[PDB]
Write a protein that binds this ligand. Sequence first.
Ligand SMILES: CCCCC[C@H]1O[C@@H]1[C@@H](O)/C=C\CCCCCCCC(=O)O
Ligand SMILES: [Fe+3]
Length: 836
Amino acid sequence: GHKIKGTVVLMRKNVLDVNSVTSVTLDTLTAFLGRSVSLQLISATKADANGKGKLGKATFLEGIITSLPTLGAGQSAFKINFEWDDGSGIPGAFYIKNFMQTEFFLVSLTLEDIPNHGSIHFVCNSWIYNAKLFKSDRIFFANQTYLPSETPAPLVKYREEELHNLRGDGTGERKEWERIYDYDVYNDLGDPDKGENHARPVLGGNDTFPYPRRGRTGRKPTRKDPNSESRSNDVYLPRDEAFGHLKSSDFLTYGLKSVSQNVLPLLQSAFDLNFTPREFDSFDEVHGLYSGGIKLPTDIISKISPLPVLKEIFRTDGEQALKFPPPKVIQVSKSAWMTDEEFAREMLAGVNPNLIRCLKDFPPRSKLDSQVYGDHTSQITKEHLEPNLEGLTVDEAIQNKRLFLLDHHDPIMPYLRRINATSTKAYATRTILFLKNDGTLRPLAIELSLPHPQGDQSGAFSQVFLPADEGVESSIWLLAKAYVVVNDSCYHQLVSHWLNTHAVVEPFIIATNRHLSVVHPIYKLLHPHYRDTMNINGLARLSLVNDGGVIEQTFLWGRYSVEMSAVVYKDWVFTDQALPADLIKRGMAIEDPSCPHGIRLVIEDYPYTVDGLEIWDAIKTWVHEYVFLYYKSDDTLREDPELQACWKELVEVGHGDKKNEPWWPKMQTREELVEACAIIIWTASALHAAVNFGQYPYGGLILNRPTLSRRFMPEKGSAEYEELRKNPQKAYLKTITPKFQTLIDLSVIEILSRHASDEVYLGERDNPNWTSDTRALEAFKRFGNKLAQIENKLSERNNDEKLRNRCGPVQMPYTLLLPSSKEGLTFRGIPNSISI
Ligand SMILES: CCCCC[C@H]1O[C@@H]1[C@@H](O)/C=C\CCCCCCCC(=O)O
Ligand SMILES: [Fe+3]
């Protein structure tokens, strides 16, 4: 016979729970010693009566192992020997039963085997609730990755079974301890019961507002509307998708939620009352935000200061003062943001450097229906370009690819009259930029469009303004770019960020868990990039993009914010999400086998793109090596039932509204899976970081990144034009986001732009030893080494003086694509997943 030695590693709840960590021998671990936790080995080679592997005797935990050279923080180890013997096969999985009442996080199990076999490792990382709540014991598998063959015959039934356990079908209200993954439409952002004005359109499951599906939660429907789901202070997400933290400071989502319930009202009581002026009177009043900070009543400062997480982040001067960290944008020069140079630069290296396009014709047209501003150009004339520069015809300019455009016209046009009827006054902008010979981009003309002169047909009511270095013409031009940036800020926030990243990824996380076994090779490749994504998205539906959320209250599109992104989703295509595909689609690059990445870039000094191509290639190379390690032929792929079931569900369900698009890759080729996995991973890591981490550094100054517009362009000589003359600064302040909203926006994007101390970066980072496949382990080490190589390569670039665009007049070297970072508001770092 024999006795297999086992080592169990877990963490107690009050080591990861936010309530406990509020503050962050004694042996509480003695509670785990009686008959509190039992494990039961399952044979991987010895099949019982029919197929199903053979279970071992139920063994309870006996003994604390006070120390291991490899232990860790907040972790607890226990010894437990299992009775085994030659003939009982090799352990391949096991069942765990928690009788403790209080749940615990099981990290792992190691086995000092018996027959000619080395230690067997199990990486668990799961919350084990009381055994009373499941009816089917929580199962865990060994370190080995296996194709859907489910390989070990005796294990095959245990594999599909757990799969069935994860889907759970679509009925009932999900509870906190469950691990069920399923889809549902966006129908919980609104509050129809609290007013017909609070009802919001259901996004998805219809032609008009298509949308990716979100994680199903089954609360009862709304009274006033059955098609709507009841609101709750607790959105459910399969347990485990919600990651805990050892420190009271890394619970960023908590900080965001508490900023939307506690910080908001209390903050308005200071305005609604009078303890603070309602509007900024000068740029100087805005700069004081990072020096002295908003003097706030003592009463308030006592509450919005001690609460968990909101520490440090909320710089306080003891009392009253509510200082803000100075954004990197005004650290060196608090005036460079006004540069046309910096305005255009941020289009290539800013918070949203993904939109710019290369003009193919002139004047730029529209994608709108039968109205005439779509049936026929914009009002930017050929005798409006180049006010002193080179001196090339518009054709010659286009011919040598020197003209670029930032088109913010179509998405907001259809909703303009509606939006202009509120306290918000906006335009549907377009701006043309010329590529100077010095390598810089310069704004040549901005076109401010309004809707319907009369009626709606031929609703092309536009006014084009041109750069002006002098007098009131510069004040008018500085307001002109502000109307564009307000458009951009909003598109970025709702589409570039929320939609192209957060929303689009959720269906993949659901589809993956529902059909790929934890033991499946592809599951293990993708999993790290899904970390905490469903959790942050749940907070979003709760306090960000909801009925009266922060986004509806802080951005230009207002209450129509999300519907519009769903209208934008109309044009989303998975395969164009791959960076090289994106670049070409926009005319920013052309296919060229000669070049270091198969493509030739227009504007070589395009930070986001030059850096991103490196990381894109790094990711893609890594996935390819990993994939071809497991799939022998293309047929091996067409035979994978779990993968095939997974892709079909993603297409037909998760993104069900596009299930009929002809650009969906067929999982018939190994090359198509590499591509699909590369894009997903690219989206979850580098894309989100590139779009999410430069929010405060650039936008932490409302002047540089305004969120909403409250005034139309002052006219000819009216008293609005006369004040622009006498006081331009005040004319600017009255046109952009008011003081109260500026305070909200800064509070939120300062958290959003942070790195938690326990962030797992793309930088070859995982949790423990995910696999026993040595070959994969090595490929993963190569990936990591190439990343470190890349980081140095990019830092050198930031030193190259011939690449002004990486720094601009603001002297802000582009570091958003550097793989590593230390923690906090670092203008750098690429997390494995969308974690905030
Ligand atoms: C605990 C933190 C959770 C974060 C939740 C985030 O997902 C939400 C996000 O996608 C949705 C909208 C963010 C909009 C910000 C865009 C501002 C950019 C404008 C500029 O400054 O120039
Ligand atoms: Fe984000």
